Amino acid sequence: LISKIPFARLVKEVTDEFTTKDQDLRWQSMAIMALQEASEAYLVGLLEHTNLLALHLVPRGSKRISGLIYEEVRAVLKSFLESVIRDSVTYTEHAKRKTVTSLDVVYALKRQGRTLYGFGG
């Protein structure tokens, strides 16, 4: 487990294909932390999003058959990761840098509609 983390490798592997643009880029430890932030962030967002439905709607917990939630979450994450690379290469290139940081990921998440710049009380 601690010695080896296959999940990080798998997530990194998918992302690496997207980041195949590793023409000279470099993956920092933070980059990986970004993956952790991404998965948990997506979930909090999903969980929190599901909570609002609870206000008047009743999610169908049973018979979870609707375009495979796992497929959707995965494809949706893929979109996030893919966009992240585009945003990352963009910000890195903006800074003529060749490195992936959780910070750039955060920047990507921010524009993704996170933090709401504090507009949302």
Side-chain angles (χ1 to χ4, degrees):
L1 179 61
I2 292 169
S3 294
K4 183 178 178 62
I5 175 169
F7 179 63
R9 293 180 181 278
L10 289 170
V11 176
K12 286 167 67 280
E13 283 268 10
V14 169
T15 305
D16 288 347
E17 293 286 349
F18 304 172
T19 320
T20 175
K21 291 179 179 180
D22 191 61
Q23 58 229 295
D24 272 343
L25 273 61
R26 187 181 296 277
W27 278 59
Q28 312 303 304
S29 180
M30 296 295 178
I32 302 177
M33 292 295 290
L35 279 53
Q36 298 292 300
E37 292 182 354
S39 179
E40 71 190 6
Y42 190 84
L43 287 170
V44 171
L46 181 66
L47 151 62
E48 291 285 350
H49 285 186
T50 59
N51 179 60
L52 297 179
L53 302 180
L55 290 170
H56 193 279
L57 292 168
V58 55
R60 299 182 67 81
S62 297
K63 299 171 71 172
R64 292 182 181 278
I65 306 175
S66 181
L68 280 284
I69 292 169
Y70 294 95
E71 181 63 21
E72 289 171 345
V73 171
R74 287 176 60 190
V76 169
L77 288 172
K78 169 169 175 179
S79 172
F80 160 66
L81 295 175
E82 289 281 357
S83 180
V84 168
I85 311 300
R86 286 277 300 277
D87 289 347
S88 182
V89 175
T90 292
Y91 279 118
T92 51
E93 286 287 349
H94 183 72
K96 43 80 176 184
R97 205 84 84 192
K98 33 178 172 62
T99 302
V100 185
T101 63
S102 65
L103 265 67
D104 201 337
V105 171
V106 164
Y107 302 174
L109 278 164
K110 184 177 177 63
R111 58 174 295 175
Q112 205 68 246
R114 301 276 299 173
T115 87
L116 268 60
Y117 196 85
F119 268 35

